[PDB]
């Protein structure tokens, strides 16, 4: 029964100090998961491509393909702000989801267009309504002139992963192609890489989370 | 019905978690608190002592009977070798880990931690591949088909069942929303996720003891077994649940144990119940492992007992 | 029928003129039969990746009209477009605002 | 599956587009060859070594011969069983060596010559043919106990139809395609001959479907057939569909290959100087669709994967190997159910409900499984695995 | 069960070895024979370390001018013929390498005893409780 | 009935069809709507290919489903 006690106290001791070790972390608690633990506390301890010359090069190449293949035909064209950076979607900060910048892009240049169903505002008004109904409470509403406006509640662009901060990197203006508005979302200040797209909200609580920075998102 | 053969369990000691018979029918893997129990089928044990800190929760065979993967809440996972001792020592999670499980090749290991995230390891390399951050809740199981591997279901504790990708690690189909895109006290825990055999729909047990098949092509649920009383529906542990596919079966069963000592078999073709096992009433069955004609199951106790 | 030989390789500028421009410059005594539509495809791939700029500056100025400012823009706001017009200078094209630090107050 | 969840517009694109990774070696690779799914990379580095990577790390898994009988210098051939299980691999040190791949320690089988190897291929039962270095006819290994047989200049690439694994097909030095009818064990006459160059054919390369065929001629030109068989391995003809060719620089090709199935796509890689591409051509037409772009040196040899869908090319300079993958971009749409991304502004068109507020027993077959996905690749076929060696794990 | 396992241990220590030593060792009269003949030109081939015949009566007059070829003790060169590589020269090697890989899992497997020693040494451990 | 046909470029299109027409009435429908002739076209719906000769019906398509078309793109 030597074994019992001289591996105990040897295996034990070595894997505790390994564990303080590896643990930079405060020590959470917790036990098994056999028992029914929820633990939903508020607050979480843990965590929480080429060139551009290529990009135009394919993209010309590809709408003189379609634009080849069109005499056997409308029902082809295609959106023409294509000029937009690579970015991706992952879990933020400022809110849960939120749109991070994958390549390192200068300022005063275009990212993305905010893209939705075009409706009008008694519409907009309904739905806004509706969602607040379901528990929705998030509103991707936009407004693009006095008597149209933009959702992209179920239908749009990655453009809806974009956070309120009190401090932006990026505005939004609103251009006219083809003699209609669209919204466009440009770098007010040079963005580095694997960094959040902030922007300003402008509504007219806040997780901010900025240094200087005010408590409301209205 | 199947038949009752032998508990030939160890009931001494701490809980055990689950057991889960090797991919030959030959052997039963239960776990205690920091060592291994394994019992050969043949009445015989031997048992295998671990590094973990703390008490582990699922442990998972591989695919040629040579390793056994085991997931402490010390926030790291061990893979031992059956025979050469201890293998690899994956440390990257940050949380809990519960649930684990490895694809038909035994190339890469999943891992399901409570950091809201899940991990693909490379087994051989003992390296980290990939991480996958897609849940702002409990992430409680992740489950690769044995036919296929390039998909993985995931279900938390918000209801979220996602599907991703073995290669890349995407999300592929979300069949259930989360508090933000639903009334928020309609939200129910998903406790169990399982694959068909075929990879085609998707068993999945939740805390309010019903059990659904998707269509995960068309996301939408085709099957609902229940207990028509709700006495241990309301449930809180990981109540075991399994699907058993009889060797040259008609249509496969599927199988569940409820907070009591109770389990279950309905025809999934029919809905039609065909029998329930109960003790043989005692404590809330722990966990269910079936295979070809078989069927393991391990109560909150140390209770253990097997059919045929 | 008749097939304009630019016409044969996707191409809009013209092949025929610069094959006869070729012949008729005096640049050699023989001129390839394919050298005319190699050139005139690079002729048109740079007009087109500089009228591209051209065109995304005249648009994020909020006019609809390219004009030799927009065209300075495009070029020397570039890095490799610059090299190849680093000696040219573009009558109305202004230059490109740049103010040092040391003069920057503080 | 991962496929029919998929989006069928990303998975269906025709051929790679973008690379990817970029394995590196230590040694210089040679050789290289798929498993016959898309699992396995078997590469033949600088020296006789012999590696096993697996596609779903990029790192190896196995490496034969590390007990005794490895190859000692530069391999010429790698060819894999249609299960998966025995490997084929012949080297410039004379020997062909199949591999049982339950045992990868030592070498199942091997037998021996008086002459480097150009390449080595499958037949079944187990039978090898082989083409060796300066002579004028094949061999054919059965060797279940090791015995070989023998069967307009040389003879240096040989290849079995698909369709009809009787016929077998070789291309001489001098310019002539030559015909064998495996009607016998070791007793094969020709069916058909003819010459269609002045220089060495170095390819032979043939659809899945036995309905084209292919060839690399040491003039700077590719000749593209449409052969057929018929009359119980009799009846065979060539009709010139195509040649293809450098119009710029003239530079030569190092390797070619073909699509799936109906080889709707001809993959050639160059050879010259300042020659760092990959070209593309269809074969109805013949036109050039696509020049893969990627490496910085001279790509000798190729390999596709229809199952994965990518192409794998070893440089030559270096020795790294490049892939070319299909690549799907993460879509947010599938974070809900009912999330539909668009790329324009839709309109919205309303009833005038809108603004006025205010059993199932379908068929379900679980045990059944999917022959064909998206693709068209066969699923189902045997995929015998590697098993993994743990001495070579504790340290 | 385990002795069956890592017993192979000791073949692999002995008799494999000792085969293969021999059959590397071959190699040295089978290449002194053709040095000897080629020293007194001609590149000396391979084909005649089979059983290490180099079935010859006196080979410096044997290769003498009536008969280039090796008519007896064949080697496969007639000439200064680039047909073969002449493995003669560093054949070794590939049993060097093989020694080599020899040596190799003999240390390897000599450490692989050592770990499930530790294991058992805890396993009786184990079973006398 | 109505059934969708989605097209890569961003368009789709809201067919008028009958379950007992032929797929290949289906193709002559998106060609004299559209006027893509049905050689050229290429016609998928939950990740199997419509094959040629069979009909709507046997694929059990029913109203406002939705089906993507993607064109065997040449030179
Ligand atoms: C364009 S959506 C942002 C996307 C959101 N993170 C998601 O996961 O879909 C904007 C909405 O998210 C929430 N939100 C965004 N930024 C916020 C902030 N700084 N503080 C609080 N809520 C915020 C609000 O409900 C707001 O109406
Ligand atoms: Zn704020």
Same mark, same amino acid.
């Given at each position: ?218 | ?308 | ?106 | ?73 530069? %391999?010429?051939?790698?060819?894999? *069983?249609?299960? !998966?299980?025995? &490997?084929?691999?012949?080297?410039? =040190?004379?020997? +062909? ?103 060495? %054919?170095?390819?032979?390369?043939? *659809?899945?479907? !036995?309905?084209? &065929?292919?060839?690399?001629?040491? =003039?700077?030109? +590719? ?109 947010? *749409? ?62 | ?129 | ?75």
């Amino acid at each position: 029964s030597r074994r019992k006690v001289l591996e105990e106290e040897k295996a034990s001791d070595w894997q505790i100090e390994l564990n303080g070790t590896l643990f930079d972390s405060e020590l959470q608690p917790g036990s098994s998961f056999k028992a029914e633990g929820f633990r939903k506390i508020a607050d979480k301890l843990k965590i929480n491509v080429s060139s551009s010359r290529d990009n135009r090069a394919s993209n010309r190449r590809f709408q003189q393909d379609i634009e080849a293949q069109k005499a056997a035909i409308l029902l082809s064209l295609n959106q023409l702000n294509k000029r937009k950076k690579p970015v991706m979607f992952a879990r933020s900060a400022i809110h849960n989801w939120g749109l991070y910048a994958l390549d390192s892009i200068a300022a005063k240049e275009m990212i993305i267009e905010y893209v939705g169903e075009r409706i009008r505002q008694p519409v907009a008004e309904m739905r806004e309504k509706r969602y607040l109904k379901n528990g929705i409470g998030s509103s991707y509403l936009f407004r693009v002139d006095e008597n149209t406006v933009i959702d992209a509640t179920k239908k749009g662009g990655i453009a809806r992963f974009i956070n309120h901060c009190c401090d932006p990197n990026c505005t939004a203006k609103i251009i006219k192609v083809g003699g209609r508005r669209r919204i466009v979302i440009y770098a007010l200040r040079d963005i580095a890489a694997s960094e959040e797209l902030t922007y300003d909200y402008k509504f007219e609580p806040c997780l901010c989370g900025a240094p200087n920075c005010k408590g409301f998102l209205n | 019905m199947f038949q009752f053969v032998t508990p030939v369990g160890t009931q001494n000691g701490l809980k055990a978690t689950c057991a889960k018979i090797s991919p030959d029918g030959q052997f039963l893997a239960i776990t205690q608190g920091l060592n291994i129990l394994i019992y050969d089928i043949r009445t015989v044990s031997q048992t295998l002592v671990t590094s973990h800190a703390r008490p582990f929760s699922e442990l998972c065979w591989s695919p040629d009977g040579q390793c056994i993967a085991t997931a402490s809440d010390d926030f790291s996972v061990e893979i031992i070798h059956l025979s050469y001792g201890l293998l690899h020592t994956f440390i990257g999670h940050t949380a809990p880990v519960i649930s684990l499980t490895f694809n038909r090749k035994g190339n890469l290991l999943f891992t399901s931690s409570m950091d809201e995230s899940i991990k693909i390891w490379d087994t051989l390399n003992g390296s980290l591949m990939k991480t996958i951050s897609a849940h702002s809740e409990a992430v409680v199981s992740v489950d690769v088909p044995m036919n296929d591997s390039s998909i993985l279901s995931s279900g938390s504790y918000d209801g979220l069942i996602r599907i991703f990708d073995a290669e890349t690690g995407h999300c592929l189909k979300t069949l259930t929303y989360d508090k933000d895109w639903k009334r928020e006290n309609g939200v129910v825990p998903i406790s169990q996720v399982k694959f068909s055999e075929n990879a085609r729909y998707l068993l999945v047990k939740s805390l309010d003891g019903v059990v659904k098949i998707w269509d995960c092509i068309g996301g939408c649920v085709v099957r609902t077994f229940q207990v028509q009383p709700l006495e241990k529906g309301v449930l809180h542990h990981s109540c075991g649940m399994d699907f058993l596919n009889p060797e040259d079966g008609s249509t496969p069963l599927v199988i569940s144990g409820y907070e009591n000592g109770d389990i279950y078999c309905w025809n999934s073709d029919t809905k039609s119940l065909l029998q329930l096992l109960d003790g043989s009433h005692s404590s809330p069955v722990m966990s269910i492992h079936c295979f070809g004609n078989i069927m393991c199951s391990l109560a909150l106790n140390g209770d253990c007992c097997l059919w045929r | 029928k008749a097939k304009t030989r630019s016409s044969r390789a996707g191409l809009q500028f013209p092949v025929g003129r610069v094959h006869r421009l070729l012949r008729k410059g005096n640049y050699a005594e023989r001129v390839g039969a394919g050298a005319p539509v190699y050139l005139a495809a690079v002729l048109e791939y740079l007009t087109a990746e500089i009228l591209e700029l051209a065109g995304n500056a005249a648009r994020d100025n909020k006019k609809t009209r390219i004009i030799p400012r927009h065209l300075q823009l495009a070029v020397r706001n570039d890095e490799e477009l610059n090299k190849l017009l680093g000696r040219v200078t573009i009558a109305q094209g202004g230059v490109l605002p740049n103010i040092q630090s040391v003069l920057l107050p503080k | 599956m991962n496929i029919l969840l998929q989006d069928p517009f990303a998975v269906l694109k025709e051929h790679p587009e973008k690379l990817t990774h970029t394995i590196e070696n230590p040694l210089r690779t040679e050789c290289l060859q798929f498993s016959p799914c898309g699992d396995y990379l078997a590469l033949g580095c600088a020296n006789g070594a012999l590696v096993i990577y697996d596609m779903d790390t990029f790192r190896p898994i196995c490496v034969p011969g590390n007990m005794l009988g490895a190859h000692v210098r530069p %391999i010429t051939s790698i060819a894999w *069983s249609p299960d !998966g299980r025995l &490997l084929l691999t012949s080297s410039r =040190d004379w020997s +062909i060596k199949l591999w049982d791949l339950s045992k990868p320690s030592k070498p199942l089988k091997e037998i021996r010559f008086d002459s480097p190897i150009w390449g080595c291929q499958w037949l079944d039962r187990r039978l090898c043919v082989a083409t060796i270095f300066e002579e004028s006819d094949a061999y054919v290994i059965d060797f279940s106990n090791d015995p070989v047989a023998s069967l307009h200049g040389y003879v240096l690439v040989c290849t079995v139809h698909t369709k009809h694994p009787n016929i077998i097909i070789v291309g001489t030095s001098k310019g002539w395609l030559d015909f064998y009818k495996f009607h016998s064990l070791y007793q094969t006459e020709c069916i058909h001959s003819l010459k269609i160059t002045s220089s060495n %054919i170095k390819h032979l390369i043939v *659809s899945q479907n !036995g309905e084209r &065929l292919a060839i690399n001629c040491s =003039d700077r030109t +590719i000749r593209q057939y449409e052969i057929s068989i018929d009359d119980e391995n009799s009846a065979v003809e060539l009709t010139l569909e195509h040649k293809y060719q450098d119009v710029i620089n003239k530079l030569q090709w190092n390797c070619i290959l073909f699509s799936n199935n109906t080889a709707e796509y001809l993959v050639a890689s160059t050879h010259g100087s300042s020659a760092h591409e990959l070209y593309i051509w269809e074969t109805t037409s013949g036109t050039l669709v696509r020049v893969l772009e990627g490496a910085e040196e001279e790509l000798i040899d190729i390999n596709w994967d229809f199952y994965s869908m990518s192409i794998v090319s070893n440089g030559f300079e270096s020795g790294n190997v490049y892939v070319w993958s299909v690549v799907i971009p993460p879509k947010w *749409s599938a974070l809900a159910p009912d999330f539909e991304e668009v790329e324009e502004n839709v309109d919205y068109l309303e009833k005038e409900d809108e603004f006025d507020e205010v059993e199932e027993e379908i068929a379900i077959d679980l045990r059944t499984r999917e022959q064909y996905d998206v693709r068209g690749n066969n699923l189902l076929v045997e995929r015998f695995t590697i098993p993994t060696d743990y001495t070579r794990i504790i340290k | 069960l385990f002795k069956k396992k890592l017993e192979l241990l000791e073949v692999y220590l002995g008799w494999l070895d000792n085969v293969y030593t021999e059959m590397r060792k071959l190699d040295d009269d089978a290449a002194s024979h053709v040095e000897c003949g080629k020293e007194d030109n001609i590149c000396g081939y391979c084909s005649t370390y089979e059983r290490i015949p180099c079935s010859v009566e006196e080979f410096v007059r044997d290769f003498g001018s009536n008969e280039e070829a090796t008519k007896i003790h064949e080697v496969c060169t007639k000439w200064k013929c680039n047909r073969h590589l002449d493995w003669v020269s560093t054949n070794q090697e590939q049993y060097l390498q093989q020694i080599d890989s020899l040596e190799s899992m003999q240390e390897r497997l000599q450490h692989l005893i050592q770990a499930r020693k530790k294991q058992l040494n805890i396993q009786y451990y184990e079973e006398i409780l | 009935m109505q059934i969708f046909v989605k097209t890569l470029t961003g368009k789709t299109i809201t067919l008028e069809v009958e379950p007992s027409d032929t797929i290949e009435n289906v193709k002559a429908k998106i060609q004299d709507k559209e006027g893509i002739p049905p050689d050229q076209q290429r016609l998928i719906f939950a990740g199997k290919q419509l094959e040629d000769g069979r009909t709507l019906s046997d694929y059990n398509i029913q109203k406002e489903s939705t089906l993507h078309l993607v064109l065997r793109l040449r030179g």
